[PDB]
A paper describes a structure:
Important mechanism for complement evasion is acquisition of the main host complement inhibitor, factor H (FH). The main AP regulator in serum is Factor H (FH), which consists of 20 globular short consensus repeat domains called SCR or FH-domains. Binding of FH has also been described for RF agents, and a ligand for FH in [name] was shown by Hovis et al. to be a plasmid-encoded, surface-exposed Factor H binding protein A ([name]). By determining the 2.2 Å crystal structure of Factor H binding protein A ([name]) from [name] in complex with FH domains 19–20, combined with extensive mutagenesis, we identified the structural mechanism by which [name] utilizes [name] in immune evasion.
The structure of BhFhbA (residues 44–202) reveals a compact, single-domain fold, which is composed solely of a bundle of nine α-helices. The first five α-helices (α1-α5) wrap around the core formed by α-helices 6–9 with the overall architecture of the fold resembling a curved arc or capital letter ‘L’. The structure of BhFhbA is thus a previously uncharacterized fold and further represents a novel FH-binding scaffold. The primary and biologically relevant interface in the FH20 domain has a buried surface area of 1066 Å2, as determined by the PISA server. A careful analysis of the primary interface reveals that α-helices 6–9 of BhFhbA form a hydrophobic cavity in which FH20 sits. Within the cavity, Trp1183 of FH20 surrounded by a sandwich like stack of aromatic residues sits between two BhFhbA residues: Phe154 from the hinge region and Tyr170 from helix α8. This tightly constrained binding pocket is further coordinated by the hydrophobic sidechains of α6 Met137 and Leu146 and α8 Ile171. Moreover, towards the C-terminus of FH20, Tyr199 from BhFhbA α9 forms van der Waals interactions with FH20 Val1200, with the closest approach being 3.8 Å. The structure, combined with mutagenesis and binding studies, led to the identification of a conserved aromatic residue, Phe154, that is central in binding FH. However, the interactions are different: a hydrophobic binding pocket is formed between FH20 and BhFhbA, whereas the FH20:OspE interaction is mainly electrostatic in nature and mediated by hydrogen bonds.
Author numbering:
A (entry chain A): 44 to 202
B (entry chain B): 1106 to 1231
The structure:
């Protein structure tokens, strides 16, 4: 518990609220469909390209989608204080940019089928939430390590 | 006399008014483009002593190719769709597919559409 408290002592209110937000999405089963689609799409690519039979055979099995506080704390410990704070801070910026309507991505062709900002905010939020969930459970399942979780989720959180 | 004839035609565009055969000096016409085409240049043209000012252009939208995306190991960010119409001047956002990292220059994941032409980023096996 000492290392977890050593991280929480370094976090501001914005980072602490991003932590509550991320943990909350990991406990939401409505994102299970996103993980199954990601699982199928990733297995199909490996099968098509005849790559990594060991990983394909692990991907034919059911992924664990159960939340566990100790596994959550282990991810933050494996990232180290620095990466964990950079991740929570960037999660704050992404969420604030959606809330404010200032996210640059909103002007992209990727949202131009939507009539108003509220619809745009909903697409952005539902996509970020799905990515936080998918990336965490790919880690929990051993398909990716803590460093891979970090670099992959930071790509999606870029503003 | 400083009178003009009919204003010039522009590909995938048209004038906002009904076409007259003769136009008075300093008279003006405005152009509009087809649904997904983007106007580039001035919207209005004026008849200046028997000659019209330079008409604008209506530039083509970019059609996001599912096959190019598959070959470059990329996908559209924010959506599950592999089909997208991008207008000239708009940015398109991509992500690497899972298991791939960016192999093209940084900032290539966000790129501008211009008259049907788009530069796609490339991702390579991690």
């Amino acid at each position: 518990l000492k290392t977890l408290d050593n991280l929480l002592k370094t976090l501001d209110n914005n980072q602490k609220q991003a932590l509550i937000y991320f943990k909350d999405k990991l406990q939401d089963k409505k994102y299970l469909n996103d993980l199954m689609e990601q699982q199928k799409s990733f297995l199909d690519n490996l099968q098509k390209k005849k790559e990594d039979p060991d990983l394909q055979d692990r991907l034919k099995k059911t992924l664990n989608s159960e939340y566990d506080e100790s596994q959550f704390n282990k991810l933050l410990n494996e990232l180290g204080n620095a990466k964990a704070k950079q991740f929570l801070q960037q999660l704050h910026i992404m969420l604030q940019s959606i809330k404010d309507g200032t996210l640059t991505s909103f002007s992209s062709s990727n949202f131009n089928d939507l009539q108003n900002l509220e619809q745009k905010k909903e697409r952005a939020l539902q996509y970020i939430n799905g990515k936080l969930y998918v990336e965490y459970y790919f880690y929990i399942n051993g398909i990716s390590n803590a460093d891979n979780f970090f670099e992959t989720i930071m790509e999606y959180l870029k503003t | 006399t400083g009178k003009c004839g009919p204003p010039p035609p522009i590909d995938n565009g048209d004038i906002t008014s009904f076409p007259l055969s003769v136009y008075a000096p300093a008279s003006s016409v405005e152009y509009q483009c087809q649904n997904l085409y983007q106007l580039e240049g001035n919207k209005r043209i004026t008849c200046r002593n028997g000659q019209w000012s330079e008409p604008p252009k209506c530039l083509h939208p970019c059609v996001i190719s599912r096959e190019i995306m598959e070959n470059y190991n990329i996908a559209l960010r924010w959506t599950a769709k592999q089909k997208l119409y991008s207008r000239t001047g708009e940015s398109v956002e991509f992500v690497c597919k899972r298991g791939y990292r960016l192999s093209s220059r940084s900032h290539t994941l966000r790129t501008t559409c211009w008259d049907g032409k788009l530069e796609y980023p490339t991702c390579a096996k991690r």
